[PDB]
Design a protein around this ligand. Structure first.
Ligand code: C6P
Lengths: 385, 388
């Protein structure tokens, strides 16, 4: 029996180097950076270094803005409610396009905007678990204010064609925001190559601390503040800076790009080992194409067994995983398949989500394979099918 | 910097090593998401319950009440103001908010943006004692006032507001009462049912907690449209993954603050009074606000020949960290020159020096600050061609 964490898409471990980078900024260095005295200014070089690491990690340019928020939920709320305020309540627009598979910080915010009279189209997802750019083009009207599509999905790990969608959005002169939380540390992130106007990210998903996130804004494009007040973050987001959070986020982002550039294949190899071994069990289906999937994610549907029961049995075995909604469909020459679906859909059964990190070991994968096969056999012996 | 001395505690505070130790496991040792169902996520749950319990116990909240953990008091203020605007103004029959001219910018600028949305806002000016009295609030409440937002204690003068009396008047009028209570925790007794407030904002980095975490108290879980929508965190009132280290540290820090309250009433007050009396020994110096209504850790002193920003820079060169405060000139009832608080926007406002202590201030820090303060005043008055 060994404890094994494979829920990294939900949250990640803080790299000991990140915690070490953060440590001084609680008790040794505690001044407010907005103070003029030496106590406040002592942390300023660390803040500049952190912001530089962030800009370098996502490929933003000097004209661009990167506002430090409390979480990606704040960033998504900010983008949606601010563009609603700027272009919809005091503009000539009334439409926002998104997908059925967004994070609740996008979906519920869009539903509240719907409650305010905003027309929103929640774009359904294709067989590949993705939304394609031509459907976006077809749904853009002359009143669409913003298109908000996640960069990569948190349940399936499917990567969205963010560059093509950006090209379509620029042709129609409409703003483009992406929830890039699942992208940082897992796929190359270049926000001018992706052409996004806004990007949300969260540090505790690439091994930074919880409680700090960010919103990237191309060229400092106007966006009414969600938090008003002092002139923090260039007057775009008030509230005292989470100095430890900022330092740790910068360090974690730098480390994430470093391990993406060298250790991409170690994590990808372990995911592929786990997925191939699990698919050796009869009547198991991995959701989404791997050649378009983040290197760390598997979403498996097991037949007869229920995803939550599989999670409970794994947790009793010391293995932490999560859920993901999937639906049943047919292919074109290998008919039975499981495809991504909105959690609200009535067609949805629950599949098991296993998400690795650069800290996963091959021993964890061997134990996980063995215990997965044991749990499948055990729960199918007790299954109603 | 002959000796480094921190007297800018009203701006931010050092993290108590016990608070940092309480936080330590929840970065690398305990990292699961508390919203997960597996054991990795649920491992931190008892610490979260204990931290939330410490908060309820520290401010005297009841079980029916709600305490939502935010990212900072700025988030709490934005949330309260914009939410009551959404609830009672854009989808109600109300259109008026009453506040003061001395609020923190997270309240003032939010109110200005709401004015830009058509909300009537009256920024009540402050009296000689540096406070807003309850009868003035009563005089400005109409049947259209949606919310009254008045800070519990001032961050520049430390003056304590009569939040209880204002609450009684608000209850007579059936209007909601919010207080920005950031300056109150750890400095004065905080009892949110005795204060009768409906909302209270607070920020952990003011009472030796970490930066990046705050809270909003809600008296009966009163409806308030979420500032952050999404998952059902904090009872569905503020979504976003929990800042577990921040929450743990905030609970520990608030418990420590209530324990150290008597230390701050007695010893910290004694050191503040030493520093203030020593400074007031300098000719043509004026302390803003009456001490008998002031938090034990705050001084806002006006010097006559000297300029406030130059005085702060000169103190920092001596290793002393302080801040500013806006002040105006007046006379008392005996027609004696005194300095009184004023909104920073007023053209009658000059800059005063703000010195704020903490439970970690030592008497050596106070003696060194007295000496260097007197030296800097003499130096800056010695070069003036105008001082009499
Ligand atoms: C009364 C009051 N209300 C809100 C805040 C802001 O707290 P946050 O957690 O950063 O949002 C503060 C902190 N203001 C600091 C620095 S901005 C001062 O120099 O006085 C405050 O004093």
């Amino acid at each position: 029996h060994m404890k094994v964490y494979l829920d990294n898409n939900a949250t990640t471990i803080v790299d000991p180097e990140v915690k070490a980078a953060m440590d001084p900024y609680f008790t040794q260095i505690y001044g407010n950076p907005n103070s003029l005295h030496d106590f406040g200014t002592e942390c300023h070089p660390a803040l500049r270094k952190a912001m530089d690491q962030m800009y370098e990690a996502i490929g933003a340019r000097d004209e661009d803005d990167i506002v430090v928020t409390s979480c990606a939920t704040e960033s998504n709320n900010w983008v949606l409610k601010g563009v609603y305020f700027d272009l919809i309540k005091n503009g000539d627009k009334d439409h926002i396009i998104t997908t059925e598979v967004e994070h609740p910080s996008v979906t519920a915010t869009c539903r509240w905007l719907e409650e305010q009279g905003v027309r929103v189209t929640y774009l359904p997802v294709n067989q590949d678990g993705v939304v394609e750019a031509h459907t976006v083009r077809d749904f853009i009207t002359d009143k669409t204010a913003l298109v908000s599509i996640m960069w990569a999905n948190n349940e399936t790990g499917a990567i969205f064609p963010v560059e093509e969608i950006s090209e379509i959005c620029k042709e129609k002169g409409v703003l483009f925001h992406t929830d890039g939380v699942q992208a940082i540390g897992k796929i190359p992130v270049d926000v001018i190559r992706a052409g996004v106007d806004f990007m949300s990210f969260s540090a505790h998903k690439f091994h930074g601390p919880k409680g700090v996130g960010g919103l990237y804004i191309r060229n400092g494009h106007p966006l009414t503040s969600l938090l008003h007040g002092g002139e923090h973050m260039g007057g775009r987001r008030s509230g005292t800076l989470n100095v430890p959070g900022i330092v740790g986020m910068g360090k974690a982002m730098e480390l994430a790009t470093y391990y993406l550039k060298f250790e991409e294949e170690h994590v990808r190899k372990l995911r592929d080992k786990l997925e191939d071994a699990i698919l050796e069990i009869p009547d198991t289906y991995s959701v989404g194409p791997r050649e378009n999937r983040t290197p760390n994610t598997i979403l498996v549907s097991v037949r007869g067994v229920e995803g939550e029961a599989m999670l409970w049995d794994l947790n009793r075995a010391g293995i932490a995983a999560s859920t993901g909604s999937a639906c049943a469909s047919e292919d074109l020459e290998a008919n039975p398949i499981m495809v991504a679906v909105g959690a609200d859909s009535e067609l949805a059964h629950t599949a098991v989500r296993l998400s690795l990190s650069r800290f996963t070991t091959e021993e964890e994968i061997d134990y996980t394979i063995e215990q997965f096969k044991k749990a499948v056999e055990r729960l199918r012996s007790i299954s109603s099918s």
